[PDB]
């Protein structure tokens, strides 16, 4: 079957794993559990297509920069995740977009900008600023909460559709 190699990237603690585990296993993980590199494979049906989601949940930490070029090369589509109550993680986003474009020799890599933790009241990144950054990249902006599941399927399925239309 058709396989979609998805990679989730972004600063430490923004919710990459909580998003991925919500999509694949339908629960919100509240605990502290830093990732090194996890892979998730799930057979699903998206818009009637039978397909394999091959998802790589990556580390936010700098100390594993050596793994990054390799997974960026293999990935077909990226979720670039920040948290809406962490301005630094938003400010960091362009670093991920820049390294992916360089390693993939492409200025149009399938990608979704994901503003996670939108269930939280104490927002410090306004949606408009994030929507403007996404527009500047020519990619969708989607807000998510791994806690309530708001936007989760949307973010991952939109990324699949970006790959289909690439
Ligand atoms: N309220 C809220 N908290 C969230 C949400 N997403 C993740 N969190 C919380 O934020 C923390 C870090 O989440 P986690 O998924 O481990 O982040 P990560 O980006 O995978 N971290 P790392 O880069 O270390 O692997 C956890 O306490 C998790 O419960 C969200 O949408 N809402
Ligand atoms: Mg993680």
UniProtKB/Swiss-Prot annotation:
Q: Which InterPro entries has this protein been placed in?
A: P-loop_NTPase (IPR027417), Small_GTP-bd (IPR005225), Small_GTPase (IPR001806), Small_GTPase_Ras-type (IPR020849)
Query: Record's superkingdom?
Result: Eukaryota
Carrying N-acetylmethionine, the residues are 1
Q: Where does the record place the modification S-nitrosocysteine?
A: 118
Spell out the CDD domains in the cross-references.
H_N_K_Ras_like
The UniProt entry's GO biological process terms, in alphabetical order, are: adipose tissue development; animal organ morphogenesis; cell surface receptor signaling pathway; cellular response to gamma radiation; cellular senescence; chemotaxis; defense response to protozoan; endocytosis
Annotated tissue distribution: Widely expressed.
Q: Name one GO molecular function term.
A: protein-membrane adaptor activity
Annotated membrane topology is:
Lipid-anchor
Q: What Gene3D superfamilies does the database record attribute to this sequence?
A: P-loop containing nucleotide triphosphate hydrolases
Q: How is the protein's activity regulated, according to its record?
A: Alternates between an inactive form bound to GDP and an active form bound to GTP. Activated by a guanine nucleotide-exchange factor (GEF) and inactivated by a GTPase-activating protein (GAP).
Q: Per the record, what are the reactions this protein catalyses?
A: GTP + H2O = GDP + phosphate + H(+)
Q: Which residues carry this modification: N-acetylthreonine?
A: 2
Keywords assigned: Acetylation, Cell membrane, Cytoplasm, Disease variant, Glycoprotein, Golgi apparatus, GTP-binding, Hydrolase, Isopeptide bond, Lipoprotein, Membrane, Methylation, Nucleotide-binding, Nucleus, Palmitate, Prenylation, Proto-oncogene, S-nitrosylation, Ubl conjugation
What EC number is given for this enzyme? 3.6.5.2
Q: What GO cellular component term, any one, is given?
A: GTPase complex
- Please name every pair of cysteines joined by a disulfide bond in this record: none
Say what the protein does.
Answer: Involved in the activation of Ras protein signal transduction. Ras proteins bind GDP/GTP and possess intrinsic GTPase activity.
The family line of this record is:
Belongs to the small GTPase superfamily. Ras family.
The molecule here is called: GTPase HRas
Species annotation: Homo sapiens (Human)
């Amino acid at each position: 079957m058709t396989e979609y190699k998805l990679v989730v990237v972004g600063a430490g603690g923004v919710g990459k794993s909580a998003l991925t585990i919500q999509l694949i296993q339908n629960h919100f993980v509240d605990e502290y559990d830093p990732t090194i590199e996890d892979s998730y494979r799930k057979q699903v049906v998206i818009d009637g297509e039978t397909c394999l989601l091959d998802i790589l949940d990556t580390a936010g930490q700098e100390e594993y920069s050596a793994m990054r070029d390799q997974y960026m090369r293999t990935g077909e589509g990226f979720l670039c995740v920040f948290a809406i109550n962490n301005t630094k993680s938003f400010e960091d986003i362009h670093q991920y977009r820049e390294q992916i474009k360089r390693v993939k020799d492409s200025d149009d890599v399938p990608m979704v900008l994901v503003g996670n933790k939108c269930d939280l009241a104490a927002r410090t990144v306004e949606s408009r600023q994030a929507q403007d950054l996404a527009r500047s990249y020519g990619i969708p902006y989607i807000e998510t909460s791994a806690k309530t599941r708001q936007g989760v399927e949307d973010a991952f399925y939109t990324l699949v559709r970006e790959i289909r239309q690439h």
